[PDB]
Design a protein around this ligand. Structure first.
Ligand SMILES: Nc1ncnc2c1ncn2[C@@H]1O[C@H](C[S@+](CC[C@@H](N)C(=O)O)Cc2ccccc2[N+](=O)[O-])[C@@H](O)[C@H]1O
Ligand SMILES: Nc1ncnc2c1ncn2[C@@H]1O[C@H](C[S@+](CC[C@@H](N)C(=O)O)Cc2ccccc2[N+](=O)[O-])[C@@H](O)[C@H]1O
Ligand SMILES: [Mg+2]
Ligand SMILES: [Mg+2]
Lengths: 381, 381
């Protein structure tokens, strides 16, 4: 009863993640001046251009173009050879007012803005209460990004912004509890200058990234390390591959564990239950595991447009519930403590605050930042 | 142990799904002249425009703008009041050659074009070997679209192209076997002309769609029927809500059941393992369930860029395996019969054929079309 399972992550410079980060830079800019802003900001990119498009209802006075350029600059796209230059690229803005489609309402009464379903997941595999596969892939991309962007030397002058990683873990399953046995395969592909060669890259990545973030007791002489295995990776970013907001939902969330409802997070203010419903669903799953009531947990919420109370809620603990608890009682405990009406949601999690830019690379979940109230678990019994 | 669980679908005029369909209409246009075409065609839309962008290496001579307009016309966007007019919209094309980044190779040697993971899922709930929740939501949108587009007597002159549906089913679980007990909530939001009343819409949708595709023995006087519950829905399409390719990956796949690796399908030729790997993975799960070896099955495959054999393969049958089988034996049987090397994949599933436009609404899986070889199961033992 051993098996292999993989998750991936991407760097901040990946073209899709670049769009997520612009989308949430713009959301934060609106929120800093107008906490009641309605934002649905989508971003796309290809050679020499970025376009932001969608619907914004706000009082904020935001220089969207400036925000775009600044965000691109911080991620490090400052020349055509790297795939995009924030100085020269075209920025196209096509942002309109939210669709038009009376009675006084309290916060409890506020309807969901759309239908949909959202899931939350937690597992006792890691201290983050996230799947180890996801934690390790995301650690590798986050460290590459840190060392390139806010590092300290030309110990990394050669590293360009694009890249990805993928981690395969060998697991045992004993009574529905997942116990990592070893890291099976670690793949990293990173974009680099012309004047460095693939051997130097391997050395750097193994020693300064892989061995830095992957636990040594999970690695052995059979662990397969693949670095830039398809060859050279000097051409990257938008110049090689189009990017769009909302095309990294699994990297954003559980790395193939759990489930997903389909909704993207970035660029959306918290009245989009695709974001706020998934954030509360995480808190619930994490609370249940943190409380010792199970080892793994999946939560589904679903909503109807114009309706305040969710149409449904679902809890699955994969048979791992503690003695005397079961998914029926856990649902009853959840319904006593947690409130998924979207107005309550938003207030509980302080989701009008301009905190979203930090979530748009590195994953939304398993994060330690003090501003992410959905990662601060509640004791339940 | 009872529980509720929801899945959703959208109409082919939904702005995101419009973009999927343009993307695959362009893919098929290329393939029909050049079966070796490399395509990565992304689409977005907002008021008054469509933009097509990405990478295409082909000998095909395709009039991209004409394909965009014909695809929009056929979906029914022929006026600004409906949210888009194929006759007046701007169509912007920003397509480039695929990136650069060699020795003689056989088909078996061809490396995956990217890393990533892919999931296949099957369940004996329905004859399509698909989750009931997804089958029903998708039935409702598909029937709406059919009646609007391919039927069309003034009897539906009032229906507009945008819409969504969501179905919630109450299940019993036994030993990982899902048994639907009743339909709990059906929600449909459809776009309509100004001169029809929300009251006439209910009656039509209930009688000509809902009761037509939802099994009467799963509906009862407690089943909650919600039609346009947020209000009027006259403004829609791109005018009200931006669309992008690859933003309906859960509608495209299993409706929140099973899992997803993150990759979109539409606009991509079959050398993108995000599409071809998921399709093979569906074949495998479906063959296992069809063969009576379990009631439900999830398969994950994972690839490394440049590498022909998958880095990992995973089968989970949720404890529903038949006597004498387990996930270890099933993985050994799969590895005897199926070959996930991408050059072999494509050839066994005939994925160079221009069949993709049919996939881009209505779901990729549970489909009966003769041209979808990933839906034709193998007997295994
Ligand atoms: N040379 C490279 N080596 C490894 N990974 C790369 C390389 N170039 C891009 N990528 C990364 O792949 C992502 C998706 S790229 C999506 C492909 C697609 N838009 C296409 O047109 O084929 C895939 C890719 C993977 C590996 C090698 C080369 C390519 N490629 O040139 O398309 C892209 O956004 C980058 O993060
Ligand atoms: N009047 C409506 N009633 C029901 N569904 C609608 C309506 N208008 C659009 N939709 C459907 O919702 C989809 C996402 S729309 C995405 C929201 C977003 N772009 C925004 O800016 O808020 C959400 C929506 C749902 C229900 C009512 C109104 C809205 N809305 O005007 O944003 C959109 O693509 C349509 O399929
Ligand atoms: Mg992408
Ligand atoms: Mg959308």
């Amino acid at each position: 009863e051993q098996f292999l399972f993989s998750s991936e992550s991407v760097c901040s410079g990946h073209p899709d993640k670049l769009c997520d980060q612009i989308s949430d830079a713009i959301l934060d800019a609106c929120l800093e001046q107008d906490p009641e802003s309605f934002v649905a900001c989508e971003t796309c990119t290809k050679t020499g251009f970025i376009m932001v498009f969608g619907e914004i209802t706000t009082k904020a006075n935001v220089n969207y173009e400036r925000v775009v350029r600044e965000t691109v600059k911080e991620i490090g796209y400052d020349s055509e050879e790297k795939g995009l230059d924030y100085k020269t690229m075209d920025v196209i803005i096509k942002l309109e007012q939210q669709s038009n489609q009376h009675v006084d309402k309290n916060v409890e009464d506020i309807g969901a803005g759309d239908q949909g379903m959202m899931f939350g997941y937690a597992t006792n595999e890691t201290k983050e209460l996230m799947p180890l596969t996801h934690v390790l892939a995301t650690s590798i991309t986050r460290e590459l990004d840190y060392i390139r962007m806010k590092g300290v030397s030309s110990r990394v002058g050669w590293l360009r912004p694009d890249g990805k990683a993928q981690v395969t873990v060998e697991y045992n399953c004993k009574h529905g509890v997942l116990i990592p046995k070893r890291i099976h395969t670690i793949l990293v592909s990173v974009q680099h200058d012309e004047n460095i060669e693939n051997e130097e890259i391997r050395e750097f990545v193994l020693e300064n990234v892989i061995k830095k973030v992957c636990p040594s007791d999970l690695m052995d002489k059979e662990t397969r390390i693949l670095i830039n295995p398809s060859g050279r990776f000097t051409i990257g970013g938008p110049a090689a591959d189009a990017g769009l907001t909302g095309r990294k939902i699994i990297v954003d969330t559980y790395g193939g564990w759990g489930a997903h409802g389909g909704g993207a997070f970035s660029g959306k203010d918290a009245t989009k239950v695709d974001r706020s419903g998934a954030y509360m669903a995480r808190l619930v799953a994490k609370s249940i595991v943190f409380s010792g009531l199970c080892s793994r947990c999946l939560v589904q919420v679903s909503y109807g447009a114009g309706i305040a109370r969710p149409l449904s809620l679902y809890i699955n603990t994969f048979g791992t519930a503690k003695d005397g608890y079961n998914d029926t009682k856990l649902l009853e405990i959840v319904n006593k403590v947690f409130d998924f009406r979207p107005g309550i949601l938003i207030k509980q999690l302080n989701l009008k605050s301009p905190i979203f830019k930090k979530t748009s690379s590195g994953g939304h979940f398993g994060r330690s930042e003090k501003e992410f109230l959905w990662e601060k678990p509640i004791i339940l019994q």
